[PDB]
């Protein structure tokens, strides 16, 4: 169903698209996995520690 | 407790210390007073050192 819901968009079923390097602009070999992970800021801050 | 098993006495500070910056400033001012009194005549210097 993930794969189907990818086909609903025009995204690839494999989940791996081909990416280009920012500084040079030459495509990474062997495509990479990019999606939307839901990140959280944990309450371990660097100025509560330094 | 339970943070480090440190009893209460570890956090009571000593407020009678001349902190090393304070002693540094003291002795700097001492040397500066000396090198100022150098720029006075002998009478003025003796009377200001002794007064």
């Amino acid at each position: 169903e993930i794969k189907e819901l990818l086909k609903l968009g025009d995204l690839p079923t494999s989940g791996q698209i081909r990416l280009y390097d920012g500084r040079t602009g030459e495509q990474f070999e062997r495509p990479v996995t990019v999606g939307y992970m839901y990140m959280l800021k944990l309450n371990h801050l660097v100025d509560d520690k330094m | 407790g339970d943070d480090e098993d440190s009893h209460l006495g570890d956090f009571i500070e000593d407020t009678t210390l001349e902190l090393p910056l304070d002693s540094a400033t003291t002795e700097s001012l001492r040397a500066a007073t000396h090198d100022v009194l150098a720029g006075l005549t002998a009478r003025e210097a003796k009377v200001l050192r002794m007064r």
Binding site: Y36, Y38, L40, N43 | -
Partner: protein, 100 residues
């Protein structure tokens, strides 16, 4: 809100006291960054009552961990509500769901 959740988020957000939930359906008589006034549906008036009930939002306040607890209104003027609908999004919720 999480793009990939489970369906637990609304429950965790509501059942905790961060989001201001309606007590009776009605219309949002007046909204504001600090308060929501609801004019109850006449079915739920409790005939002695005046009719409208007020929710005062908890603005920028200090939690135990120095974070900011702050409720934001979700509804808008003249919009219906039903009992159990959230009016104020609490800290780290989004339209009623737990959004960490």
């Amino acid at each position: 809100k999480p793009l990939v959740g489970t369906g637990m988020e609304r429950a965790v957000a509501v059942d905790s006291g961060v989001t201001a939930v309606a007590k009776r359906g009605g219309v949002v008589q007046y909204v504001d960054a600090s308060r929501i006034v609801i004019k109850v549906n006449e079915d739920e008036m409790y005939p002695g009552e005046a009719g409208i009930d007020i929710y005062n939002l908890t603005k920028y306040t200090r939690s135990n961990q120095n974070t900011c607890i702050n409720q934001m209104p979700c509804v808008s003027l003249g919009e219906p509500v039903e009992r159990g609908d959230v009016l104020a999004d609490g800290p780290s919720t989004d339209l009623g769901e737990l959004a960490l």
